[PDB]
């Protein structure tokens, strides 16, 4: 009925947050590239997607070997792993700011809860997703207030020039780089794409003209995607005004933000720990759909790659597992630092930026060969190869 | 110096354990370095324990092994816990720290008001 969708996920939450409380204005560039680059590939995938009648997964095992299609598997797997990490570690933090329980509590409750998505399922959609959009809305509604006194041609001069020396110099500035460019693309969300535009009422085969399908989703998915950079835009410069210029240059993770929103002076005394609340919620909610939404993704990889086949709930519950393991790990190694959980989930969402061209090549070719092919691949090329040239650098500095 | 309020000593045994856990008073922002300062009836304020901005966990000399001090950077509290007692680590435990009230104004001193705890059968 009504409008719900949420569209804030904990890994681009955290990462654009984080290139606004370091750095500054400089990262905001990056963003829009990124953003107008995954626009393209959607594109493409969705014209494999509609063709030739094949899912990107079966693509790949149809230009292999069982050797090589064991490889890319793990890497597939790997990169829901790494999507699935930062959901986990999004919804523990967020449960401990809101009721107090430690860390350790809150990811095991996470792992071996699923089945509040039963039960919520055999409750009611449209409600929840009105409330889950009401909240979301409300909660950038927050943000958008607390923007202060800015300097607009900073901003801008700074989106336009693209200091290179700096965006490449810094191997702190790398690091967030590929952060945002793996969280705005999400492989996971190419397989998933490919798979479900097999499903529009298409004429399969029977309609030549069936391309108006082709433009009608690839408008759906323009649109979602800008608004998506839109919302990314604004947590970027809102991590910006709320810690640039200061003294011993806070990080900027999730905690200092919701401290932050609470001594808030302006905002009163009680108006603090009222939005405090209510960014808690949004947190949670985030974390929940993004893991809600990658299952499927999962289960048509291996599907594809291995043409094997599980029920829903093994498959969820054995992902989020061996999900959970390196966070434990991490956190009693580490004792329980704010600082290094945080570290961690930025490291996550960079390996996603680096797993992606293993995903990504083979994309390229198969759409250079079937009835339809863009004219212009020239652009993925460039992509790919400038791409491979900064994730190698990157690697290379350690 | 007030606005700080340490919490948690009491009589224990020889070889028992406990949490002290300084504070704050109202909504603070952060808590940039802590340190816990013993005062026993006799001597001088010697010092115990310090962490700091990320985390250093410096000990005194006498002590490693049953200290464990830590932070919560949730609600803004740094913990000491105290294991396997002693008859002589009796004193009141002060507490120092560097607070922050907003995200912008500069740093400032805090001294606490400290806690007693005694070590006997």
């Known amino acids: 009925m009504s409008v719900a969708v949420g569209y804030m996920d904990p890994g681009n939450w955290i990462t654009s947050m984080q290139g606004g409380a370091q750095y500054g204005y400089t990262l905001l560039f990056v963003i829009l590239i990124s953003s107008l680059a995954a626009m393209l590939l959607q594109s493409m995938t969705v014209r494999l997607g509609i063709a030739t009648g094949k899912d990107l997964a079966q693509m790949t095992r149809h230009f292999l070997s069982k050797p090589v299609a064991i490889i890319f598997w793990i890497i597939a797997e790997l990169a829901i792993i790494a999507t699935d990490i930062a959901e986990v570690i999004g919804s523990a933090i967020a449960l401990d700011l809101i009721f107090g329980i430690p860390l350790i509590v809150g990811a095991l409750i996470t792992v071996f809860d699923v089945f509040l998505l039963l039960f919520i399922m055999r409750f009611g959609f449209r409600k929840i997703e009105a409330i889950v959009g009401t909240l979301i809305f409300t909660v950038l509604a927050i943000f958008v207030f607390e923007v202060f006194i800015s300097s607009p041609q900073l901003t801008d001069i700074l989106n336009g020039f693209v200091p290179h020396k700096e965006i490449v110099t810094n191997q702190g500035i790398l690091y967030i780089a590929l952060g945002i460019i793996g969280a705005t693309i999400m492989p996971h969300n190419l397989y998933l794409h490919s798979s479900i535009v097999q499903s529009r009422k298409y004429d399969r085969h029977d309609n030549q003209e069936k391309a108006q399908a082709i433009k009608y989703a690839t408008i759906d998915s323009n649109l979602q995607l800008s608004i998506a950079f839109v919302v990314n835009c604004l947590l970027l410069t809102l991590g910006a005004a709320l810690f640039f210029g200061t003294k011993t240059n806070d990080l900027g993770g999730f905690y200092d933000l919701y401290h932050a929103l609470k001594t808030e002076p302006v905002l009163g005394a009680t108006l603090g720990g009222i939005m405090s609340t209510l960014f808690a919620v949004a947190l949670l909610a985030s974390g929940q759909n993004s893991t809600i939404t990658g299952t499927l993704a999962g289960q048509i990889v291996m599907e594809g790659f291995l043409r094997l086949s599980i029920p829903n709930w093994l498959r969820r519950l054995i992902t989020r597992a061996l999900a959970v393991i390196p966070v434990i790990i991490c956190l009693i190694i580490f004792k329980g630092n704010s600082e290094k959980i945080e570290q961690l989930l930025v490291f996550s969402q960079v390996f996603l930026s680096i797993a992606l061209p293993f995903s990504l090549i083979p994309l390229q070719l198969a759409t250079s060969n079937k009835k339809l092919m863009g004219p212009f691949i020239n652009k993925t090329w460039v992509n790919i190869i400038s791409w491979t040239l900064i994730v190698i650098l990157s690697g290379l500095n350690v | 110096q007030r606005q700080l309020v340490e919490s948690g000593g009491g009589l224990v045994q020889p070889g028992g354990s406990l949490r002290l856990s300084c504070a704050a008073s109202?909504?603070?922002?952060?808590?940039?370095?802590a340190g816990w300062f013993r005062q026993a009836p006799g001597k001088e304020r010697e010092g115990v324990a310090t962490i700091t901005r990320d985390g250093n966990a410096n000990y005194a000399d006498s002590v490693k092994g049953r200290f464990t001090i830590s932070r919560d950077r949730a609600r803004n509290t740094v913990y000491l816990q105290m294991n396997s007692l002693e008859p002589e680590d009796t004193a009141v435990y002060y507490c120092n720290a560097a607070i922050r009230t907003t995200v912008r104004t500069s740093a400032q001193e805090y001294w606490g008001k400290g806690t007693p705890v005694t070590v006997s059968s």
């Open positions: 109202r909504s603070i922002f952060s808590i940039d370095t």
